């Protein structure tokens, strides 16, 4: 029995995106998963780091820090309840897959707030309890990312770099940070430019691909792999 | 008579971010500089991509493609005006300096949002105006980061790697992409744990480069300088 989570960012549910994550819910149900969709658009996810995320008595009331109140806040139960929300679905997850459009090489806002928002000090890692020894440890995050740019722009000789590159801040700074272990990420390349036959084929690699998903080992998180 | 922008994601005027923002707008405002300062947080700015940022008839109302209705909206001046106040001072700008805190080896939701919904195809690039070609050439770009880790844990070999690693998706994939020359990074390491004095060091070495900051080169915004 496993349990998985889509967190998933694109306004359109006709889009490649809508259709790459009906995939993934469709097979990993078929499989007999336990599945979770966090819609954030849908949902009008709050993306800012504010401090209405805090709803009691602020530790410092005079000089707001963030991550300092959020931390206290997590430990007293005092976060707001969409970030509580959303541990409870991360938590009891087995899987995390990330599901977006590529948006200036990273996150599209709306999704880089859930980040910001979700994996607070104490909920995520702590310090110490970081990397290897973060507190979601145990875990697996997938990004599936779609792109404007071709496959070939994203090359080390292309004028975009190598794919890996922008994966770093996710993967790295982000994912392994809080102690999940990376699976590949799915990348599907330019579908807007693609042909008919081509968008159908990388939909079905999404779909095969998942079917022997948790047979899987995790990549190597680490500066080579990204840099090489 | 030069002009800047300053955007500014902080939440609190007494942080070192909103210190580093002052001293800025101190001494680019006694050079006789104009200067302008989006605090986005103040102006509780929006970060969702969403159907709310055309004002007109959409271009295609059964299937919503943000890059495509914005686009078009750019095109026919039916952006949101929260859009085309904020490109209204970057059109003007010499400068635009990003004033923020790192967020997840990136920059927080609200400046990511910042990213995704003021800088749309036809005003910050387009075919074939992108990277040396980006359509605001002739400006110069500036990111000023604050971080939790120390420069030692931002080397190559450290746990985060090099700084430079995650600077890639801001500095190469938006603004190189919109055609700025970017200016080296201000990076002021670690200011929660540094001393009095390291802080004031901090802030004294930013005031002091501004002091001379329309005498400096742009890097060459190349792989090679973020990675080799
Ligand atoms: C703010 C912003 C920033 C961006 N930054 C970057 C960047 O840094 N780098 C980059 O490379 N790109 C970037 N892009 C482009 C972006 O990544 C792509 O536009 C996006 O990934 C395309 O995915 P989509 O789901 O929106 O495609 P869609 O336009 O929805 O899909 C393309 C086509 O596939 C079709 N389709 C849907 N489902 C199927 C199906 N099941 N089988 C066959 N066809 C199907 C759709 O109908 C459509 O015709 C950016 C875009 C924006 C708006
Ligand atoms: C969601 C989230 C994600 C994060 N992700 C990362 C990450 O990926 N990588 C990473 O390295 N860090 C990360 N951090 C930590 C973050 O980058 C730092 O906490 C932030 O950069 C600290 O800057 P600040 O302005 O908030 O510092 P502050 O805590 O406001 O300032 C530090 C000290 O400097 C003092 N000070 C202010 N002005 C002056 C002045 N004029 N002269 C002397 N002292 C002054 C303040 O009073 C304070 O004591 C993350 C934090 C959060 C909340
Ligand atoms: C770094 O490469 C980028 C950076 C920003 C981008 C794009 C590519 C990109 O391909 C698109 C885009 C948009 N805003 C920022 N970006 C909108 C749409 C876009 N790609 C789709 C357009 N086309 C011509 C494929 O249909
Ligand atoms: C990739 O390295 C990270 C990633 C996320 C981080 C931090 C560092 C980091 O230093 C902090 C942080 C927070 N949320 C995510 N992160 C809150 C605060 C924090 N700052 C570290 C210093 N300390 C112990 C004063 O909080
Ligand atoms: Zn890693
Ligand atoms: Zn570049």
Redesign the pocket.
Known sequence: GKKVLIVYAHQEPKSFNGSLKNVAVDELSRQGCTVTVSDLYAMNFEPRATDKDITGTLSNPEVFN???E??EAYKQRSLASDITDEQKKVREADLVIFQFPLYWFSVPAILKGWMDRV???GFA?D?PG?YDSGLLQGKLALLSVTTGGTAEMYTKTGVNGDSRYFLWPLQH??LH?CGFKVLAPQISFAPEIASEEERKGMVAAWSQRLQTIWKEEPIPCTAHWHFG
Request: glycine letters at 14%; proline letters at 0%.
């Open positions: 963030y991550g300092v959020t931390h994996l607070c000090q890692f310090i970081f700074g982000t940070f």
